[PDB]
Amino acid sequence: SGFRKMAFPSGKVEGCMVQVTCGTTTLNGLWLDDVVYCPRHVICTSEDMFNPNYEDLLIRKSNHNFLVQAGNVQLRVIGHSMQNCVLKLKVDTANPKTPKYKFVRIQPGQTFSVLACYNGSPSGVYQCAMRPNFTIKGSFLNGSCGSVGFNIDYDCVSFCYMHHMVLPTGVHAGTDLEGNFYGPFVDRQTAQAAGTDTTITVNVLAWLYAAVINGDRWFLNRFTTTLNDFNLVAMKYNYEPLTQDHVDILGPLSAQTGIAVLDMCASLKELLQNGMNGRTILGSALLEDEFTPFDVVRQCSG
Amino acid sequence: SGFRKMAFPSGKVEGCMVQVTCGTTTLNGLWLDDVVYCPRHVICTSEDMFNPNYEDLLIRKSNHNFLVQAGNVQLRVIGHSMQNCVLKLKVDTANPKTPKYKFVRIQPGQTFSVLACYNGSPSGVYQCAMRPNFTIKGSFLNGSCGSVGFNIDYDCVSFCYMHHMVLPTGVHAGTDLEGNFYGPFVDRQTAQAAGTDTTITVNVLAWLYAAVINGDRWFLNRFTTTLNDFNLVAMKYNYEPLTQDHVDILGPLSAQTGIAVLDMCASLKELLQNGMNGRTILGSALLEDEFTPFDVVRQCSG
Ligand SMILES: Cn1cnc(Cn2c(=O)nc(Nc3cc4cn(C)nc4cc3Cl)n(Cc3cc(F)c(F)cc3F)c2=O)n1
Ligand SMILES: Cn1cnc(Cn2c(=O)nc(Nc3cc4cn(C)nc4cc3Cl)n(Cc3cc(F)c(F)cc3F)c2=O)n1
Ligand SMILES: Cc1ncc(C[n+]2csc(CCO)c2C)c(N)n1
């Protein structure tokens, strides 16, 4: 019973956060086995951040220019390399708290947990979605660079996000753990705009099913729609199109509630056209799109 | 808005979760030093759950009737006692992952992180507020009994909530770590109704300060009020009256913005009497009441 934004327990990741410093520049790193991963922006000085030539800056660096602190222990760097926008510091000590882990690149519309950290210390945890325009709407302050996002599946941590920067609209951009940005962004201190964001339609539908499972039905109706006719209306409102795969994924929620997927599409179509008339769904005045069908099933089965 | 419900990192609590089983009744417990804390409901058979005689259920029980497991490893119970609605099981091993900790009883309005657990295994973490009617709008399934709520200040975990039961409306009820229920509930499997809820005034005020901090301040009027006058008006709109402690925890935000607490009460009074008139605050037409003054500073300032 109930439905809330839920993050994975963050303990397995907390044991991996460290602080990395070059000169006066400092951010968070991820210590797995004998490697620390962190944004390569750390090698920038105040004058480099605007337009860094990273290969130039890195070749001028020695191992002892990197100071890595785990708690109050200093870790000795014995090698360094760059993979795209991620710096890899080889250290002489393996992290005994290293969990079983994978690096994955997540798809837009999928969710993950963010462990926000400052100076290598974990500060808070919360759930985010990869937006269709490759930004994330996180909660990050100065010093959060290098914080990571992840999912956990049977004691294996799949790291999918490393935080790099804040955009002028206050949304956030980062890379996978291979150092490739999500979206058309680049790691320099310039004002960067994202593409137009769209709403994750399959997630909104999942969250409507959550609302029904928790006893709210005011938005349901008796109208009918085809998948294509729903997608025409959805595109009009800058909603992502709904695929047959998405319809299939919503299957369990349809079975549970007895509401056909296309019947819930008919309900969403009306909400897009009429609005909510000051009413709320699961306490929200806006249509929530950062719950996947798996997130709803996980919280609402039974 | 840039505001998200953020949990504390859960690792310090994850290392304390265990499963406790009596016969087939099984739930979650909290292992700190050489004591495991858990709801006394675990000693009920199904026929006991409706109207248990705990004293009589406990006199029949011996140490060897309690199965306490960390993962699949059994912890031998060497003493047991009842304190209000919590059972305290003395075990023969001091938990090596015990953090610095305290037991605290919170007030309505205060927020905390919940580590939802099933069979001793943490499943997710999210932020909750204690409602004025002493329920929490959590997210809990069967098997969640004994999950705990907590805050972390510096490196000390303040435990404030242990989950006991779901109410007919789907909200949740439980105790502090001394076994004293929040609210008028008792640990019987009966349909107990929560009283009518109200809005957490101190947290709405914190939210208005957060809006001011971010430059959204159209709602600041030119008036002030006395605390007594504001309290009397607030109750007529199903808002909670303010306490002297409430005024004091608004102090840092009042100092940060230079807006006197009673001036902000006058501004909230005007919103109550007139409404938003089609206009929004931090992008929402709803006033948020589950961010405490500390949450606001935590998310604006760090
Ligand atoms: C408000 N906010 C929200 N998210 C963020 C993340 N973020 C950050 O934490 N730090 C950044 N720049 C740095 C400045 C430093 C000053 N010192 C002494 N050390 C510093 C280290 C960093 Cl990383 N940035 C900006 C930023 C970071 C990048 F990785 C990048 F490629 C471009 C950028 F403009 C930042 O956004 N802050
Ligand atoms: C849907 N939901 C949301 N929160 C909860 C919490 N909750 C719970 O997890 N378990 C409960 N009863 C038990 C049944 C058991 C069956 N087996 C095999 N083992 C069991 C252990 C428990 Cl604790 N309850 C009900 C409940 C638990 C209490 F502690 C109490 F005092 C009164 C109650 F009615 C429950 O609410 N479920
Ligand atoms: C945290 C943080 N880091 C860097 C800058 C950028 N900055 C400050 S002075 C200067 C010119 C070189 O001295 C630059 C690029 C910032 N604003 N905040």
Describe the overall structure.
Chain A is α+β, with helices and mostly antiparallel strands and 302 residues long. The first copy, chain A, has helices at residues 11-14, 54-59, 201-213, 227-236, 244-249, 251-257, 261-274, 293-300; strands at residues 17-22, 25-32, 35-39, 67-70, 73-75, 77-83, 86-91, 100-103, 111-118, 121-129, 148-153, 156-166, 172-175. Among the domains of chain A are: 15-91, Trypsin-like serine proteases (Thrombin, subunit H), CATH 2.40.10.10; 201-300, main proteinase (3clpro) structure, domain 3. In chain A, the strands form two sheets. A seven-stranded antiparallel β-sheet of chain A has the order 5-4-1-2-3-7-6, with no helix packed on it. In chain A, a hairpin with a 2-residue loop joins strand 2 (25-32) and strand 3 (35-39). The first copy, chain A, is elongated and about 70 Å long. Chain A starts with 10 loop residues before the first helix and ends with a helix. The relative contact order of chain A is 0.14. Chain A binds chain B through residues 1-12, 14-15, 115-116, 118, 122-126, 137-139, 141-143, 170, 214-215, 278, 280, 285-286, 299, 301-302, and chain B through 2-12, 14-15, 115-116, 122-128, 137-142, 166, 170-172, 284-286, 298-299, 301-302. One copy of the ligand Cn1cnc(Cn2c(=O)nc(Nc3cc4cn(C)nc4cc3Cl)n(Cc3cc(F)c(F)cc3F)c2=O)n1 binds next to strand 2 and strand 12 of chain A. Chains A, B: Residues 1-302 are cytoplasmic. Chains A, B: Residues 1-302 form the Peptidase C30 domain.
